[PDB]
């Protein structure tokens with residue numbers, strides 16, 4: 299998160315920190331959020347060979363009793379996920395156990411307006427990931443403001459962030475929820491490599507039928 303501020307610890311108890319393993323290189327990370335005691339929603343571009351989820355964290359380098367470290371047993375990536383057009387960037391992760399509900403861990407059930415995104419991602423173009431969960435408020439834009447992304451499609455995606463400001467999600471914030479009036483409306487998907495807003499978020503409402511079908515059959 300660029301241009302944001304540190305979240306009050308444990309004030310977003312649905313936030314998941316994801317550590318992604320691949321076979322050919324070192325670990326990477328993304329965000330995501332708990333929608334069921336055993337299901338985390340995140341972006342499909344965070345897929346990997348295996349993933350570990352930390353719930354209940356603030357400072358991700360300081361282990362505490364609120365932590366719940368859970369294994370992911372199966373990744374369900376959207377079947378039409380497309381790395382050419384960048385569409386359908388969405389994935390559910392089935393947890394090996396159901397998470398405990400505590401004060402620090404809980405689920406989040408289901409243009410012009412201000413919304414909030416949160417993450418442990420880089421705080422600057424050339425900066426490391428943040429140790430602590432950060433958040434920022436961002437303006438929802440008319441779809442015209444994302445025209446320069448050639449494969450942007452207003453039906454599938456949200457255009458997020460006022461170009462006149464420097465506030466943005468960045469690397470490591472992938473998969474984090476965009477909340478508008480306490481409801482998850484988007485997931486961080488992609489933007490410019492220089493972070494100039496706006497950025498493109500997955501529009502959660504278009505994928506509700508697909509979410510429901512995975513959650514009902516597992």
Ligand SMILES: CC[C@@H](NC(=O)N1C/C(=N/Oc2ccccc2)NC[C@@H](Cc2cc(Cl)ccc2OC)C1=O)c1ccc(C(=O)O)c(N)c1
Pocket residue numbers: 318326327328343344380381384385387427466467468469470471472486487488489490491492493497498
């Ligand atoms: C795990 C995934 C990996 N991230 C990553 O690829 N991206 C690029 C990316 N790919 O998006 C796709 C790809 C295919 C289909 C649809 C969307 N999306 C977002 C991105 C971060 C980002 C987000 C926003 Cl809002 C604006 C710009 C921006 O990056 C320049 C990212 O991390 C990654 C790569 C590097 C790091 C790192 O810490 O160096 C890291 N924590 C994570």
Ligand SMILES: *[C@@H]1O[C@H](CO)[C@@H](O)[C@H](O)[C@H]1NC(C)=O
Pocket residue numbers: 357358359360429430
């Ligand atoms: C996060 O925790 C570590 C290890 O306790 C501490 O060094 C660091 O300053 C904390 N970072 C914060 C509050 O940014």
Ligand SMILES: *[C@@H]1O[C@H](CO)[C@@H](O)[C@H](O)[C@H]1NC(C)=O
Pocket residue numbers: 380381382383
């Ligand atoms: C991605 O979308 C493009 C343009 O619609 C399509 O032609 C392509 O086959 C799709 N699938 C993959 C795997 O690129």
Ligand SMILES: [Zn+2]
Pocket residue numbers: 307308356362364
């Ligand atoms: Zn704590």
